[PDB]
Amino acid sequence: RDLLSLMHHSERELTYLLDMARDLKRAKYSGTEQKHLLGKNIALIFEKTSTRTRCAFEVAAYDQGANVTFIGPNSSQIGYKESMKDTARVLSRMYDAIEYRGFGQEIVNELAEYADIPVFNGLTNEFHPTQMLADVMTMREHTDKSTHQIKYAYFGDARNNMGRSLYLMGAKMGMDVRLCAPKDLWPEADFLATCADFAKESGARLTITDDVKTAAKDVDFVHTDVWVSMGEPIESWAERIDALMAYQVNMDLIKATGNPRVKFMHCLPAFHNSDTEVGKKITEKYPQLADGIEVTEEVFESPYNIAFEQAENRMHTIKAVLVSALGNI
Amino acid sequence: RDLLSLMHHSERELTYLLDMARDLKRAKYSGTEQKHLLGKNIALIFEKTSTRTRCAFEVAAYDQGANVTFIGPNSSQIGYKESMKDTARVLSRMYDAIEYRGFGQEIVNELAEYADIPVFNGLTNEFHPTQMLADVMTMREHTDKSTHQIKYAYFGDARNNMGRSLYLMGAKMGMDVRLCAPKDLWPEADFLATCADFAKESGARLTITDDVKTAAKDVDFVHTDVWVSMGEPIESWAERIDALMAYQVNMDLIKATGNPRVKFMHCLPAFHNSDTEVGKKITEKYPQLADGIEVTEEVFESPYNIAFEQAENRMHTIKAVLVSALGNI
Amino acid sequence: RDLLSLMHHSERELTYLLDMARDLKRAKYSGTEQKHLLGKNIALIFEKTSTRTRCAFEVAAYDQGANVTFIGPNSSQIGYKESMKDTARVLSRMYDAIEYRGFGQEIVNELAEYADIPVFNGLTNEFHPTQMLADVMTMREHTDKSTHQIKYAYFGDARNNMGRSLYLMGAKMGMDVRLCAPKDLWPEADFLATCADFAKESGARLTITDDVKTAAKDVDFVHTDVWVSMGEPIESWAERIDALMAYQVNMDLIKATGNPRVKFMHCLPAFHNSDTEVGKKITEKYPQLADGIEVTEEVFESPYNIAFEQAENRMHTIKAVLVSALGNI
């Protein structure tokens, strides 16, 4: 969806944000962080509740000295008696920045050019460029080696936003990335060409297989995302589960890498057990899945797992965007 | 309703708030704004969701250094197990100010005299004195001429709160105001007398016609508010729409003024098109209204429209009240 | 429930918190309060809406310079697609402290030892140790005499958390406390033994009667809590009301003390009249209760009533915990 924003950015532009995030994170850890958004007011306007990326946004903003007004579906009826267009045009005159998550990519653009101020196009939850920056910043941080030397793979539905995004990102940064999925769940091959271009001029190793052991070779990072269809009733998942349970990240797929240093990453949320309400619903129809779907309780509750460090890095990545767009240096 | 608070204020008192709002707005624009509510905590307690006047309040408070606890219907069950009386008496000992919007004008008064602290009687959303101050401050700002010289008219249901309020305000400030409505939708004539008193001693031109071209004469400002009854089902609006569609603000009513400088104002929200969910519902029964009701898409999406500047002025007006009542000078 | 945390604390530990609360309260009143939580971010994660203890927490945090992210049932779907375990482990890397109210005592413990940061086990609403500290701090403040010399009684269902807690607290601090209830609504006598131990070595007068005039003797404080079962339908309360209406706090029970200085305390909320929605429901079945249940409108709207001062003291008690656990001195 919104990875035509991630396509117009150069390796050098993306590297500027990864450096700002790396330094902002270091400043907070060493208590050298100067507030550059002191006295700025920011509206956080969400169509759906999404407490992980809300928090990431609030904490970025508060560390940088800003105030926040969260407006959730709970607290608003935006689009009911008053246009979203009208409400934005009022808030754009009161707030120094506004952040719209949900609502579709179409109207956010409309109320953006009017705006006398920054209007972030789904900077939160969205399989955003910010998600790719967090992931690359996470991998860069853990291997302590040049970005272009980093080896990673995505396992599951290569057609979904994390897969397309992690591949396009690999192609932009000159990294060694492998999409590993069923051959009928591969990106539409014209997309696979736009990535093959960037990769020649940036020198990225692209490699889209359907064989696990191929892709899992000497990778520093194994990635997956939820591949069950939450849109469709649980009753009809059988066919889907059959296609992808090969591509589950289990302890065996970690070992298959024969790199005892390898790390697992996951943008979250992650079906890895039955603690959740939807877990129970799934596992009641599908008792094989008591122990996880795209990834197992074994791997998730193991030291290979750095998804929480990676969720943290969304906060430093969001902050680096907010400071870039409102801090004046 | 709450314009018996707007009646006890003198021209000189109202002018003090309009000056504080004008200067506070200038300070924010030139970055000379000193925080006078530093370390104050304010509770914002709302019966209904109302994101435009909530935001206006939050931003006023944050620019002045204050903290805010928003309590919406979402986040509270005030009046369920615990009296509103009890909850207020606890919060009045923790917060430096409380703001009650909704709940009826009756009880807010009760828990106010107990209060060791300021308790604002519907300072938000309410067709408040603050709404009149914003509107007068908006007109004063755009004509750059003495208040008493300003010419404006309200078109639609002269009996509703904006109409009564814009007339009483005109009478207090010595302005040239015209209410223009059907003769059966005119204020109860004892109210029209209390305004005719103030106008003699302040020198205001009052003038309540039912003829558009009369009222729209050489006015600097054309005002309307929503006149459809949201209380009643859409099926039964026909009679109402027939009575008032004359009084719609369309491009022709702007031209009818023969002042190419004239501005349109609207307290919002405004049915001007079908973007809203209630828009669709109305326009499905009433396809003539695809393009707006009290005012047209033509005027609303035109440079005559300064309703958004006017919504902004509610934030500077709210701030001027908050600073007057809590800042200690 | 969570008074096995209140059992491991010594008289000298509890006295340290009561002193910090007393001094923090004095600092705010005299404007000498230094911010020790400047730049700290705190997550406030609530399963149920609970606006009195939310506010107490927010105000404690803002007076001490902290920021807050409130997450209510309104604004979250914690436990739906994402484990509470997972969400906590992400937020624990962004926030300096987290506060979990509701969710059961079991899992809060789980996600606590992981936590690189303070995780308060139901510091809000919970019949918490913080509730006991507020109550003791309230009584200490009003008698201006040594804690161990203070005389108080609880009237109603001695088996419920306030009763057990006010008794255990009395036993820890060496105070003169009386539980006064029906003999079949007395704590399980093994609990009554653990309290009788502490009381010997601290020198507390314990005394559990069923005779009002005995317990109400020369007490400085009369306490009660709601004893109707909100879990069960109103239709079936008759038997319960019959057992306890003896133990109602009415003007007569105040006089029965023959101390014209005596004060009434109540952790709130308090059924004292029909203003509430649940009031009406109760009083429609039970018209005798128009004027209150555990306590009367006569006492509640009288100067004997200091429940609001006591609710305030939850804010200074919460602050003393927050400053103890995050302020670094």
mmCIF file with all atom_site columns, N, CA and C in Angstrom, chain C residues 83-125:
data_model
loop_
_atom_site.group_PDB
_atom_site.id
_atom_site.type_symbol
_atom_site.label_atom_id
_atom_site.label_alt_id
_atom_site.label_comp_id
_atom_site.label_asym_id
_atom_site.label_entity_id
_atom_site.label_seq_id
_atom_site.pdbx_PDB_ins_code
_atom_site.Cartn_x
_atom_site.Cartn_y
_atom_site.Cartn_z
_atom_site.occupancy
_atom_site.B_iso_or_equiv
_atom_site.pdbx_formal_charge
_atom_site.auth_seq_id
_atom_site.auth_comp_id
_atom_site.auth_asym_id
_atom_site.auth_atom_id
_atom_site.pdbx_PDB_model_num
ATOM 1   N N  . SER C 1 83  ? -1.375 -10.942 23.564 1.00 0.00 ? 83  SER C N  1
ATOM 2   C CA . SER C 1 83  ? -1.323 -11.348 24.991 1.00 0.00 ? 83  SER C CA 1
ATOM 3   C C  . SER C 1 83  ? -1.171 -10.092 25.852 1.00 0.00 ? 83  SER C C  1
ATOM 4   N N  . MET C 1 84  ? -1.643 -10.111 27.084 1.00 0.00 ? 84  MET C N  1
ATOM 5   C CA . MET C 1 84  ? -1.292 -9.007  28.004 1.00 0.00 ? 84  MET C CA 1
ATOM 6   C C  . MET C 1 84  ? 0.220  -9.090  28.242 1.00 0.00 ? 84  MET C C  1
ATOM 7   N N  . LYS C 1 85  ? 0.718  -10.324 28.319 1.00 0.00 ? 85  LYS C N  1
ATOM 8   C CA . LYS C 1 85  ? 2.161  -10.627 28.489 1.00 0.00 ? 85  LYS C CA 1
ATOM 9   C C  . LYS C 1 85  ? 2.968  -9.873  27.409 1.00 0.00 ? 85  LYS C C  1
ATOM 10  N N  . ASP C 1 86  ? 2.557  -9.936  26.142 1.00 0.00 ? 86  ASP C N  1
ATOM 11  C CA . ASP C 1 86  ? 3.348  -9.375  25.015 1.00 0.00 ? 86  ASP C CA 1
ATOM 12  C C  . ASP C 1 86  ? 3.324  -7.840  25.146 1.00 0.00 ? 86  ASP C C  1
ATOM 13  N N  . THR C 1 87  ? 2.152  -7.259  25.418 1.00 0.00 ? 87  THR C N  1
ATOM 14  C CA . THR C 1 87  ? 1.902  -5.798  25.353 1.00 0.00 ? 87  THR C CA 1
ATOM 15  C C  . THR C 1 87  ? 2.736  -5.141  26.467 1.00 0.00 ? 87  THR C C  1
ATOM 16  N N  . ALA C 1 88  ? 2.677  -5.696  27.674 1.00 0.00 ? 88  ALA C N  1
ATOM 17  C CA . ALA C 1 88  ? 3.486  -5.284  28.836 1.00 0.00 ? 88  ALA C CA 1
ATOM 18  C C  . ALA C 1 88  ? 4.975  -5.285  28.508 1.00 0.00 ? 88  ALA C C  1
ATOM 19  N N  . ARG C 1 89  ? 5.446  -6.288  27.771 1.00 0.00 ? 89  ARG C N  1
ATOM 20  C CA . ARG C 1 89  ? 6.897  -6.461  27.534 1.00 0.00 ? 89  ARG C CA 1
ATOM 21  C C  . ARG C 1 89  ? 7.361  -5.409  26.533 1.00 0.00 ? 89  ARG C C  1
ATOM 22  N N  . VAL C 1 90  ? 6.507  -5.020  25.578 1.00 0.00 ? 90  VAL C N  1
ATOM 23  C CA . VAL C 1 90  ? 6.757  -3.836  24.713 1.00 0.00 ? 90  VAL C CA 1
ATOM 24  C C  . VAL C 1 90  ? 6.714  -2.545  25.574 1.00 0.00 ? 90  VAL C C  1
ATOM 25  N N  . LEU C 1 91  ? 5.652  -2.336  26.367 1.00 0.00 ? 91  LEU C N  1
ATOM 26  C CA . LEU C 1 91  ? 5.498  -1.032  27.067 1.00 0.00 ? 91  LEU C CA 1
ATOM 27  C C  . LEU C 1 91  ? 6.606  -0.894  28.120 1.00 0.00 ? 91  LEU C C  1
ATOM 28  N N  . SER C 1 92  ? 7.023  -1.975  28.749 1.00 0.00 ? 92  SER C N  1
ATOM 29  C CA . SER C 1 92  ? 8.086  -1.931  29.773 1.00 0.00 ? 92  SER C CA 1
ATOM 30  C C  . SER C 1 92  ? 9.378  -1.422  29.131 1.00 0.00 ? 92  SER C C  1
ATOM 31  N N  . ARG C 1 93  ? 9.539  -1.451  27.809 1.00 0.00 ? 93  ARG C N  1
ATOM 32  C CA . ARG C 1 93  ? 10.811 -0.918  27.249 1.00 0.00 ? 93  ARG C CA 1
ATOM 33  C C  . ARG C 1 93  ? 10.678 0.567   26.864 1.00 0.00 ? 93  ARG C C  1
ATOM 34  N N  . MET C 1 94  ? 9.452  1.076   26.803 1.00 0.00 ? 94  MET C N  1
ATOM 35  C CA . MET C 1 94  ? 9.176  2.480   26.449 1.00 0.00 ? 94  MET C CA 1
ATOM 36  C C  . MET C 1 94  ? 8.939  3.305   27.726 1.00 0.00 ? 94  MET C C  1
ATOM 37  N N  . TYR C 1 95  ? 8.175  2.822   28.721 1.00 0.00 ? 95  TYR C N  1
ATOM 38  C CA . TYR C 1 95  ? 7.786  3.571   29.949 1.00 0.00 ? 95  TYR C CA 1
ATOM 39  C C  . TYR C 1 95  ? 8.714  3.255   31.122 1.00 0.00 ? 95  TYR C C  1
ATOM 40  N N  . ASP C 1 96  ? 8.818  4.208   32.052 1.00 0.00 ? 96  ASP C N  1
ATOM 41  C CA . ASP C 1 96  ? 9.709  4.161   33.242 1.00 0.00 ? 96  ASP C CA 1
ATOM 42  C C  . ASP C 1 96  ? 8.990  3.482   34.374 1.00 0.00 ? 96  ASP C C  1
ATOM 43  N N  . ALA C 1 97  ? 7.678  3.337   34.259 1.00 0.00 ? 97  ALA C N  1
ATOM 44  C CA . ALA C 1 97  ? 6.808  2.665   35.243 1.00 0.00 ? 97  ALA C CA 1
ATOM 45  C C  . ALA C 1 97  ? 5.488  2.326   34.577 1.00 0.00 ? 97  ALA C C  1
ATOM 46  N N  . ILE C 1 98  ? 4.853  1.234   34.995 1.00 0.00 ? 98  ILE C N  1
ATOM 47  C CA . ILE C 1 98  ? 3.524  0.850   34.454 1.00 0.00 ? 98  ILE C CA 1
ATOM 48  C C  . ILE C 1 98  ? 2.636  0.527   35.645 1.00 0.00 ? 98  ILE C C  1
ATOM 49  N N  . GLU C 1 99  ? 1.344  0.750   35.498 1.00 0.00 ? 99  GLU C N  1
ATOM 50  C CA . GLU C 1 99  ? 0.397  0.539   36.587 1.00 0.00 ? 99  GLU C CA 1
ATOM 51  C C  . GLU C 1 99  ? -0.789 -0.193  36.015 1.00 0.00 ? 99  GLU C C  1
ATOM 52  N N  . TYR C 1 100 ? -1.003 -1.408  36.527 1.00 0.00 ? 100 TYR C N  1
ATOM 53  C CA . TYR C 1 100 ? -2.054 -2.373  36.110 1.00 0.00 ? 100 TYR C CA 1
ATOM 54  C C  . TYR C 1 100 ? -3.119 -2.427  37.189 1.00 0.00 ? 100 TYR C C  1
ATOM 55  N N  . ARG C 1 101 ? -4.323 -1.968  36.877 1.00 0.00 ? 101 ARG C N  1
ATOM 56  C CA . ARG C 1 101 ? -5.486 -2.082  37.775 1.00 0.00 ? 101 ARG C CA 1
ATOM 57  C C  . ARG C 1 101 ? -6.553 -2.932  37.089 1.00 0.00 ? 101 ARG C C  1
ATOM 58  N N  . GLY C 1 102 ? -6.993 -3.997  37.783 1.00 0.00 ? 102 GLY C N  1
ATOM 59  C CA . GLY C 1 102 ? -7.825 -5.101  37.259 1.00 0.00 ? 102 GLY C CA 1
ATOM 60  C C  . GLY C 1 102 ? -6.934 -6.222  36.740 1.00 0.00 ? 102 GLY C C  1
ATOM 61  N N  . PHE C 1 103 ? -7.491 -7.159  35.967 1.00 0.00 ? 103 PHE C N  1
ATOM 62  C CA . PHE C 1 103 ? -6.765 -8.234  35.230 1.00 0.00 ? 103 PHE C CA 1
ATOM 63  C C  . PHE C 1 103 ? -6.484 -9.461  36.137 1.00 0.00 ? 103 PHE C C  1
ATOM 64  N N  . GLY C 1 104 ? -6.840 -9.401  37.431 1.00 0.00 ? 104 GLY C N  1
ATOM 65  C CA . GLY C 1 104 ? -6.500 -10.434 38.432 1.00 0.00 ? 104 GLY C CA 1
ATOM 66  C C  . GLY C 1 104 ? -5.043 -10.342 38.875 1.00 0.00 ? 104 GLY C C  1
ATOM 67  N N  . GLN C 1 105 ? -4.752 -10.723 40.127 1.00 0.00 ? 105 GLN C N  1
ATOM 68  C CA . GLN C 1 105 ? -3.428 -10.547 40.799 1.00 0.00 ? 105 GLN C CA 1
ATOM 69  C C  . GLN C 1 105 ? -2.360 -11.476 40.195 1.00 0.00 ? 105 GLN C C  1
ATOM 70  N N  . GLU C 1 106 ? -2.748 -12.425 39.326 1.00 0.00 ? 106 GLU C N  1
ATOM 71  C CA . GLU C 1 106 ? -1.914 -13.598 38.924 1.00 0.00 ? 106 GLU C CA 1
ATOM 72  C C  . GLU C 1 106 ? -0.881 -13.185 37.860 1.00 0.00 ? 106 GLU C C  1
ATOM 73  N N  . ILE C 1 107 ? -1.320 -12.561 36.761 1.00 0.00 ? 107 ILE C N  1
ATOM 74  C CA . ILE C 1 107 ? -0.473 -12.301 35.552 1.00 0.00 ? 107 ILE C CA 1
ATOM 75  C C  . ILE C 1 107 ? 0.398  -11.061 35.799 1.00 0.00 ? 107 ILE C C  1
ATOM 76  N N  . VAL C 1 108 ? -0.131 -10.036 36.487 1.00 0.00 ? 108 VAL C N  1
ATOM 77  C CA . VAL C 1 108 ? 0.594  -8.765  36.827 1.00 0.00 ? 108 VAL C CA 1
ATOM 78  C C  . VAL C 1 108 ? 1.967  -9.125  37.430 1.00 0.00 ? 108 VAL C C  1
ATOM 79  N N  . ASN C 1 109 ? 1.999  -10.187 38.247 1.00 0.00 ? 109 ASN C N  1
ATOM 80  C CA . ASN C 1 109 ? 3.211  -10.762 38.897 1.00 0.00 ? 109 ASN C CA 1
ATOM 81  C C  . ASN C 1 109 ? 4.169  -11.262 37.804 1.00 0.00 ? 109 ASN C C  1
ATOM 82  N N  . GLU C 1 110 ? 3.634  -11.977 36.808 1.00 0.00 ? 110 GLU C N  1
ATOM 83  C CA . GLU C 1 110 ? 4.374  -12.637 35.692 1.00 0.00 ? 110 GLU C CA 1
ATOM 84  C C  . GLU C 1 110 ? 5.253  -11.600 34.973 1.00 0.00 ? 110 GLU C C  1
ATOM 85  N N  . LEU C 1 111 ? 4.602  -10.565 34.423 1.00 0.00 ? 111 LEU C N  1
ATOM 86  C CA . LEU C 1 111 ? 5.179  -9.498  33.547 1.00 0.00 ? 111 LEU C CA 1
ATOM 87  C C  . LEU C 1 111 ? 5.968  -8.469  34.370 1.00 0.00 ? 111 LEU C C  1
ATOM 88  N N  . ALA C 1 112 ? 6.028  -8.664  35.698 1.00 0.00 ? 112 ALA C N  1
ATOM 89  C CA . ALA C 1 112 ? 6.683  -7.776  36.688 1.00 0.00 ? 112 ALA C CA 1
ATOM 90  C C  . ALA C 1 112 ? 8.177  -8.108  36.797 1.00 0.00 ? 112 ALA C C  1
ATOM 91  N N  . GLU C 1 113 ? 8.533  -9.394  36.880 1.00 0.00 ? 113 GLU C N  1
ATOM 92  C CA . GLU C 1 113 ? 9.938  -9.841  37.091 1.00 0.00 ? 113 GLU C CA 1
ATOM 93  C C  . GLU C 1 113 ? 10.731 -9.648  35.790 1.00 0.00 ? 113 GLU C C  1
ATOM 94  N N  . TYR C 1 114 ? 10.122 -9.884  34.617 1.00 0.00 ? 114 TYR C N  1
ATOM 95  C CA . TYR C 1 114 ? 10.699 -9.500  33.295 1.00 0.00 ? 114 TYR C CA 1
ATOM 96  C C  . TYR C 1 114 ? 11.142 -8.031  33.355 1.00 0.00 ? 114 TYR C C  1
ATOM 97  N N  . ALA C 1 115 ? 10.259 -7.184  33.894 1.00 0.00 ? 115 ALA C N  1
ATOM 98  C CA . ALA C 1 115 ? 10.286 -5.710  33.769 1.00 0.00 ? 115 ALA C CA 1
ATOM 99  C C  . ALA C 1 115 ? 11.609 -5.126  34.285 1.00 0.00 ? 115 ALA C C  1
ATOM 100 N N  . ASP C 1 116 ? 12.301 -4.424  33.381 1.00 0.00 ? 116 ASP C N  1
ATOM 101 C CA . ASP C 1 116 ? 13.529 -3.601  33.575 1.00 0.00 ? 116 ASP C CA 1
ATOM 102 C C  . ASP C 1 116 ? 13.188 -2.314  34.369 1.00 0.00 ? 116 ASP C C  1
ATOM 103 N N  . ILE C 1 117 ? 12.039 -2.275  35.066 1.00 0.00 ? 117 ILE C N  1
ATOM 104 C CA . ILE C 1 117 ? 11.361 -1.028  35.555 1.00 0.00 ? 117 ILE C CA 1
ATOM 105 C C  . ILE C 1 117 ? 10.289 -1.394  36.590 1.00 0.00 ? 117 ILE C C  1
ATOM 106 N N  . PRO C 1 118 ? 9.890  -0.448  37.480 1.00 0.00 ? 118 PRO C N  1
ATOM 107 C CA . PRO C 1 118 ? 8.770  -0.649  38.399 1.00 0.00 ? 118 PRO C CA 1
ATOM 108 C C  . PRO C 1 118 ? 7.437  -0.979  37.719 1.00 0.00 ? 118 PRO C C  1
ATOM 109 N N  . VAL C 1 119 ? 6.751  -2.000  38.242 1.00 0.00 ? 119 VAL C N  1
ATOM 110 C CA . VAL C 1 119 ? 5.406  -2.437  37.800 1.00 0.00 ? 119 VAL C CA 1
ATOM 111 C C  . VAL C 1 119 ? 4.531  -2.543  39.036 1.00 0.00 ? 119 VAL C C  1
ATOM 112 N N  . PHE C 1 120 ? 3.658  -1.573  39.261 1.00 0.00 ? 120 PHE C N  1
ATOM 113 C CA . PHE C 1 120 ? 2.820  -1.482  40.475 1.00 0.00 ? 120 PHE C CA 1
ATOM 114 C C  . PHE C 1 120 ? 1.670  -2.485  40.337 1.00 0.00 ? 120 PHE C C  1
ATOM 115 N N  . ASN C 1 121 ? 1.552  -3.368  41.341 1.00 0.00 ? 121 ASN C N  1
ATOM 116 C CA . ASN C 1 121 ? 0.537  -4.449  41.421 1.00 0.00 ? 121 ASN C CA 1
ATOM 117 C C  . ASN C 1 121 ? -0.752 -3.837  41.991 1.00 0.00 ? 121 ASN C C  1
ATOM 118 N N  . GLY C 1 122 ? -1.589 -3.265  41.117 1.00 0.00 ? 122 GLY C N  1
ATOM 119 C CA . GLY C 1 122 ? -2.917 -2.707  41.440 1.00 0.00 ? 122 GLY C CA 1
ATOM 120 C C  . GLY C 1 122 ? -2.870 -1.533  42.412 1.00 0.00 ? 122 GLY C C  1
ATOM 121 N N  . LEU C 1 123 ? -1.887 -0.624  42.271 1.00 0.00 ? 123 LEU C N  1
ATOM 122 C CA . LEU C 1 123 ? -1.652 0.601   43.107 1.00 0.00 ? 123 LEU C CA 1
ATOM 123 C C  . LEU C 1 123 ? -2.881 1.528   43.134 1.00 0.00 ? 123 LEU C C  1
ATOM 124 N N  . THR C 1 124 ? -3.890 1.269   42.296 1.00 0.00 ? 124 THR C N  1
ATOM 125 C CA . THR C 1 124 ? -5.086 2.125   42.131 1.00 0.00 ? 124 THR C CA 1
ATOM 126 C C  . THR C 1 124 ? -6.333 1.270   42.424 1.00 0.00 ? 124 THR C C  1
ATOM 127 N N  . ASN C 1 125 ? -7.443 1.912   42.829 1.00 0.00 ? 125 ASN C N  1
ATOM 128 C CA . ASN C 1 125 ? -8.809 1.362   43.118 1.00 0.00 ? 125 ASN C CA 1
ATOM 129 C C  . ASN C 1 125 ? -8.763 0.181   44.102 1.00 0.00 ? 125 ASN C C  1
#
